[PDB]
């Protein structure tokens, strides 16, 4: 039974990071939660009880992003030290150090097959890397400003990138060609983007307090979600699909916002964090939302909805 509105409540608060928490990612098998911090550390927790599992170390500066491989065995991290790192989660060892970007790496993701990694950087480029060898396969002159997010589509044939230059770009993975450029009347910085689960839409956040669901092939904005505060930080956003169709996002008023995807009405606002909520994640099978907050908070919270 899909509820009319969700009913998320706080169940766990995960402490341990000593600086702002930048990202939280549920492993695809639903067993684990990975968090990256400005404290240069990755941390692995139990997805359901929040039990601390381990710390993964190696980066020399803060970490912006982390991403699971499809089999939940590997992790890729993008750091301000200009590198990405591929990690064995079980051993916590750095398997590879992807070097190539000339400045901070902000975003990273595996493709569905997980043989490739895509990264975006402050250096305004997008890079496609071979996971096995760690060598950079392609360097796309993607934008004329820092790249805020990169994401593969369901079958890995398309990449989507967002940039402070106000543009979203759809790229052909195999050929590296830019297939589409989404522009808006105004071009406020695009602080986040990702494909929808079906792959036909992209969810793009702009630093004007707005989330937008786009049909990128046609370049039409289908849905707009507002009510939250987002002018400064690149806040991650999610499609929640396990108990109703929701859009979930952090906010600069320290709340987690949840909208009805179809109607665009706010259906819930989770309170508890004491600073900007910059990252949220939705468990792959259960109605669980992980949220992470910045320097004045430093904690991860798990919310569960019985509806």
């Amino acid at each position: 039974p899909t509820p009319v509105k969700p009913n998320y409540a706080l169940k766990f608060t995960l402490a341990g990071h000593t600086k702002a928490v930048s990202s939280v990612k549920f492993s695809p098998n639903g067993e684990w939660l990975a968090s990256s911090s400005a404290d240069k550390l990755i941390k692995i927790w139990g997805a359901y009880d929040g039990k601390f599992e381990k710390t993964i170390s190696g980066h020399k500066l803060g970490i912006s992003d982390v991403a699971w491989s499809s089999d939940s065995n590997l992790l890729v991290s993008a750091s301000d030290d200009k590198t990405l790192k591929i990690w064995d989660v079980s051993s916590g060892k750095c398997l590879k150090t992807l070097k190539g970007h000339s400045n901070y790496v902000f975003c990273c993701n595996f493709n569905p097959q997980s043989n490739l990694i895509v990264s975006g950087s402050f250096d305004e480029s997008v890079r496609i890397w071979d996971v096995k060898t760690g060598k950079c396969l392609k360097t796309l002159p993607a934008h004329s400003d820092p790249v805020s997010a990169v994401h593969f589509n369901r079958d890995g044939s398309l990449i989507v990138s967002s940039s402070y230059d106000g543009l979203c770009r759809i790229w052909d993975t195999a050929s590296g060609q830019c297939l589409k450029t989404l522009i808006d009347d105004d071009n406020p910085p695009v602080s986040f983007v990702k494909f929808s689960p079906n792959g036909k839409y992209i969810l793009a956040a702009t630093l004007d307090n707005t989330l937008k669901l786009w049909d990128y092939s046609k370049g039409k904005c289908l849905k707009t979600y507002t009510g939250h505060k987002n002018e400064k930080y690149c806040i991650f956003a999610n499609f929640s699909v396990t108990g109703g169709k929701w859009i979930v996002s952090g906010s600069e008023d320290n709340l987690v916002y949840i909208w009805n995807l179809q109607t665009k009405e706010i259906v819930q606002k989770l309170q508890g964090h004491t600073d900007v909520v910059i990252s949220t994640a939705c468990h792959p099978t259960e109605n669980i939302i992980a949220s992470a907050a910045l320097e004045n908070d430093k904690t991860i919270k798990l919310w569960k909805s019985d509806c």
Partner: protein, 312 residues
């Protein structure tokens, strides 16, 4: 005469990351900040790393040790706090933080206060309590210097912020120096008689223009400890849509010059052929330590070395 004495890179680092330096209280040892936020203590003659401490999670831009060896000021690139005051006596710890001040200096006569800068605003803190004693800013008199750095005068009774002269006692701006460049906000000459604001040398008493020094354009300056020679280095131009690999990458160009501290006439021009990150001298004005970046645009990272020269 700048006779080479020693040279050394960061130990156990394929990409040496020295970014700033200052001689420590203990003779023969140099403090160096790094691009990974570390403060390291090195033997300047042997090149051996003696110590390393974590200070920030971003690169250190500037530091200053107090004269008595008990305190250290650091400023980072992109971390919280942005600047910090550390204790160096016995154990190394953080005494205080200055959250969003991108640059900090000690007071000069009595070093019981810190002056930090945030944009056009100056903050004056007490070293002991760490409390912000003063916030100096006037929108009427502001100049909006892009590289503004607030600073005390030698007797700590005057402050210079955004090209505005402030009386500390009354917290009242006494005079605005006109804006003749976009970046440099000026400093006090150690003689306490004049102010050096980019290419303009103003008299403190009469506000007359004492000197036009075109060679000081966009320069940061530091004096020997007898106040008789002034080293100046030109900041790296920021251009606009300049090539990547050229964007920032070093705070200064590859040259620094020496000036007679009384008539501001040139003495020597040294082009080390490597972008400069920082330079300093010891209390006795015997040596000049300079952080110089070797490498190429090919490099995605700096590869700096510290060179020690004999002050002729």
């Amino acid at each position: 005469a700048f006779r080479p004495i020693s040279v050394f890179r960061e130990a156990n680092e394929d990409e040496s990351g020295f970014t700033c330096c200052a001689f420590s209280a203990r003779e023969r040892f140099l403090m160096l900040g790094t691009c990974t936020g570390q403060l390291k203590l090195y033997n300047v003659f042997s090149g051996q790393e003696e110590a390393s401490y974590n200070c920030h999670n971003s690169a250190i831009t500037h530091l200053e040790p107090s004269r008595d060896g008990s305190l250290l000021l650091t400023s980072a690139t992109w971390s919280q706090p942005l600047s910090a005051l550390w204790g160096m006596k016995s154990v190394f710890d953080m005494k205080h933080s200055f959250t969003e001040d991108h640059y900090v200096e000690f007071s000069k006569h009595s070093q019981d206060r810190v002056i930090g800068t945030k944009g056009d605003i100056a903050h004056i803190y007490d070293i002991q309590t760490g409390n912000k004693l003063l916030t100096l800013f006037n929108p009427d008199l502001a100049n909006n210097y892009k590289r503004n750095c607030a600073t005390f005068n030698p007797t700590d009774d005057l402050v210079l912020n955004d090209g505005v002269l402030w009386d500390v006692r009354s917290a009242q701006a006494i005079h605005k120096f006109d804006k003749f460049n976009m970046n440099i906000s000026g400093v006090f000459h150690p003689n306490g008689l004049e102010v050096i604001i980019n290419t303009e040398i103003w008299d403190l008493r009469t506000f007359h223009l004492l000197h036009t020094v075109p060679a000081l354009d966009q320069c940061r300056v530091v004096f020997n400890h007898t106040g008789t020679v002034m080293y100046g280095a030109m900041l790296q131009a920021d251009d606009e849509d300049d090539l990547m690999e050229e964007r920032m990458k070093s705070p200064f160009g590859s040259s620094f010059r020496t000036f007679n501290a009384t008539d501001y006439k040139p003495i020597a021009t040294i082009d080390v052929k490597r972008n400069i990150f920082d330079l300093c001298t010891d209390t006795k004005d015997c040596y000049l330590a300079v952080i110089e970046n070797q490498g190429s645009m090919d490099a995605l990272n700096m590869d700096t070395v510290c060179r020690l020269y004999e002050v002729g």
